[PDB]
């Protein structure tokens, strides 16, 4: 499932804001 | 109609307060020894905010930290600047109410209020997704801050759960003001969170407050689906996905749902939701939100669908642990003319 791919991706954890 | 026109002349008044204060901003209006440090809540950006406590009042407060020459080495002087600026002369029932703001020789000091219920990203995560009527009364709320800050002419430019506080009512407070800017007119910088970044910002074209509703767009997808729309685990592929302009939703999303999102997460300016001739009407009449009392909503007379556990005043359950680490001040003065008016 969609689901299942988010849950084993690298981006789980809190995300952090990007500039430049 | 009648409702519209008592919303009208309600943001006139408020676009008098804010430009009162936008104009007379507040300084210096308290010292680092008159609190005491409990714990770490959170980091961001260039900064940690941690749970403070004021030792005159005995109240507890968030007190967000800035390492002054690290925000130099990060072009980040305006947005600072920026942060505060704004912060200090906003007034709305889902906005973070900043208290005091401070400096030193080696940093930048904001005091807000302490939001108790930790952010709805944990909840989100732990929950895993969140039922439409649920995501609805959050919805709801950001597209009535948004009406709000747009109507002051301001961009918010980081929408996000991990920006987004429970407080003890169940009601968010949004945080994080940082990529805040106040502009009339077209805006170029690179900045928010990838997986929520509108095209035209990864296509560097120019762009305004239609960010924003992409945004939300996101948001709301996330919350039901429990998943961001466009994943990955490099930045770059994210990116494509935002661009090549095609979403899957899940099949459990209402018809009504996906209609309201094909619209948000609308590649073309023209076309977005937000960004047209009725404006964030499109969006409080959309079908979706057929349900929302919209004025109730305002006045926090809605039901929370969910009320966070706070257990005593100073109470952190309901964020993360983080490693605490040294307030180290200078006995000698960092970068004072670049942050002289903070
Ligand atoms: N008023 C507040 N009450 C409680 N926690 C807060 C408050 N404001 C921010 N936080 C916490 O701090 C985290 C990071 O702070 P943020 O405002 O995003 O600044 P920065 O990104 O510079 O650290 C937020 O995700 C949240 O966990
Ligand atoms: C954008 C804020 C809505 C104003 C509602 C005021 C209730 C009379």
């Known amino acids: 499932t969609t689901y299942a791919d988010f849950i084993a991706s690298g981006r789980t954890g809190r995300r952090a804001s990007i500039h430049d | ?342």
């Open chain 2, 1 to 342: 109609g009648s409702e519209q026109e008592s919303v009208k002349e309600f943001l006139a008044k408020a676009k008098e307060d804010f430009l009162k204060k936008w104009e007379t901003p507040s300084q210096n209006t308290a010292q680092l020894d008159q609190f005491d440090r409990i714990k770490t809540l959170g980091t961001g950006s260039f900064g940690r905010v941690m749970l403070v406590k004021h030792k005159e009042s005995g109240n507890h407060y968030a007190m967000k930290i800035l390492d002054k020459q690290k925000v130099v080495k990060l072009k980040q002087i305006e947005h600072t600047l920026n942060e505060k600026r704004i912060l200090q002369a906003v007034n709305f029932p889902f906005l973070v109410k900043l208290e005091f703001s401070f400096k030193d020789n080696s940093n930048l000091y904001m005091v807000m209020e302490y939001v108790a219920g930790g952010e709805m990203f944990s909840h989100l995560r732990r929950i895993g997704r969140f039922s439409e009527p649920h995501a609805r009364f959050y919805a709801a709320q950001i597209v009535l801050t948004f009406e709000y800050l747009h109507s002051l002419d301001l961009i918010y430019r980081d929408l996000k759960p991990e920006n987004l506080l429970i407080d003890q009512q169940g009601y968010i407070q949004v945080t994080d003001f940082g990529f805040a800017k106040r502009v009339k007119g077209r805006t170029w910088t690179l900045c928010g969170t990838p997986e929520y970044l509108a095209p035209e910002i990864i296509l560097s074209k120019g762009y305004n407050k239609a960010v924003d509703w992409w945004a939300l767009g996101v948001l709301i997808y996330e919350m039901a689906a429990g998943y961001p729309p466009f994943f990955a685990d490099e930045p770059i592929q994210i990116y494509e996905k935002i661009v090549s302009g095609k979403v899957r939703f899940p099949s459990h999303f209402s018809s009504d749902l996906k209609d309201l999102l094909r619209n948000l997460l609308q590649v073309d300016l023209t076309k977005r939701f937000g960004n047209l001739k009725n404006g964030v009407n499109d969006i409080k009449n959309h079908k979706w939100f057929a349900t929302t009392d919209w004025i109730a909503i305002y006045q926090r007379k809605v039901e929370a669908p969910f009320i966070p556990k706070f257990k005593g005043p100073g109470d952190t359950s309901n964020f993360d642990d983080y490693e605490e680490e040294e307030i180290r001040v200078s006995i000698n003065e960092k970068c004072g003319k670049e942050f002289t008016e903070f």
